[PDB]
Design a protein around this motif. Structure first.
Motif, mmCIF file in Angstrom:
data_model
loop_
_atom_site.group_PDB
_atom_site.id
_atom_site.type_symbol
_atom_site.label_atom_id
_atom_site.label_comp_id
_atom_site.label_asym_id
_atom_site.label_seq_id
_atom_site.Cartn_x
_atom_site.Cartn_y
_atom_site.Cartn_z
ATOM 1 N N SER A 1 -21.975 4.604 1.895
ATOM 2 C CA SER A 1 -21.680 4.195 3.241
ATOM 3 C C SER A 1 -20.218 3.662 3.353
ATOM 4 N N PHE B 1 -22.233 -0.844 6.042
ATOM 5 C CA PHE B 1 -23.603 -0.768 6.543
ATOM 6 C C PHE B 1 -24.024 -2.098 7.120
ATOM 7 N N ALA C 1 -26.514 2.713 7.242
ATOM 8 C CA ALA C 1 -25.077 3.006 7.102
ATOM 9 C C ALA C 1 -24.418 3.160 8.474
#
Length: 216
Positions: A78, A83, A175
């Protein structure tokens, strides 16, 4: 390249538990691919806390979970953007904690912002009376759902007088940009309070977390 073998982080928590407002700042470091990390936290506002530190301890880092090569490491993927996560903890005596968190990367460091609301703990229970003595090792069951990563844990806190105090915990990890979700798997976690001062205004933690297959 962007998540290095050694990474630092900074964390800020704003919280209230049963009406008592507090803030915590901290810094930490670890080995993301090895699944280890430490943190040094301090209470900056509203200290000393009039409840058990243990309910805060799991709120302070999912980029530091060791994953097998064939389990997509959604939370590492991510980055850099990062995230968010959202958590509900239902304790066995009716206390509730809800948590929201944002994770980002700035200048080679992870930046964590946490907000926490703890409510309905019985005034005579182990949280408000500081009767807890840390977590047993836990396992988070992970699965993908509606474009995000979910995790479920039955947590057990050790009690000073012996025996245990349980919570059911569920978290959604998402994410900021769509990156690859894993299947179902488990994460084995052990979180320890390594040091603290008398009133828990300064606290050090250690955590080890490792993903394992649940099929195959």
């Amino acid at each position: 390249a962007i998540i290095k073998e050694f990474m630092r982080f900074k964390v800020h928590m704003e919280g209230s538990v049963n009406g008592h407002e507090f803030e915590i700042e901290g810094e930490g470091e670890g080995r993301p691919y090895e699944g280890t990390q430490t943190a040094k936290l301090k209470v900056t506002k509203g200290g000393p806390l009039p409840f058990a530190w243990d309910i805060l301890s799991p709120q302070f880092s999912k980029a530091y979970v060791k994953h097998p090569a064939d389990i997509p490491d959604y939370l590492k993927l991510s980055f850099p953007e990062g995230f968010k996560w959202e958590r509900v903890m239902n304790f066995e005596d009716g206390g509730v904690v809800t948590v929201t968190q944002d994770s980002s990367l700035q200048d080679g460091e992870f930046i964590y912002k946490v907000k926490l609301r703890g409510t309905n703990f019985p005034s005579d229970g182990p949280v408000m009376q500081k009767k807890t003595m840390g977590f047993e090792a836990s396992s988070e069951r992970m699965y993908p759902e509606d474009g995000a990563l979910k995790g479920e844990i039955k947590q057990r806190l050790k009690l000073k007088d012996g025996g245990h105090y349980d919570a059911e915990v569920k978290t959604t990890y998402k994410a900021k940009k769509p990156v690859q979700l894993p299947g179902a798997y488990n994460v084995n976690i052990k979180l320890d309070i390594t040091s603290h001062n008398e009133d828990y205004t300064i606290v050090e933690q250690y955590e080890r977390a490792e993903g394992r297959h649940s099929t195959g």
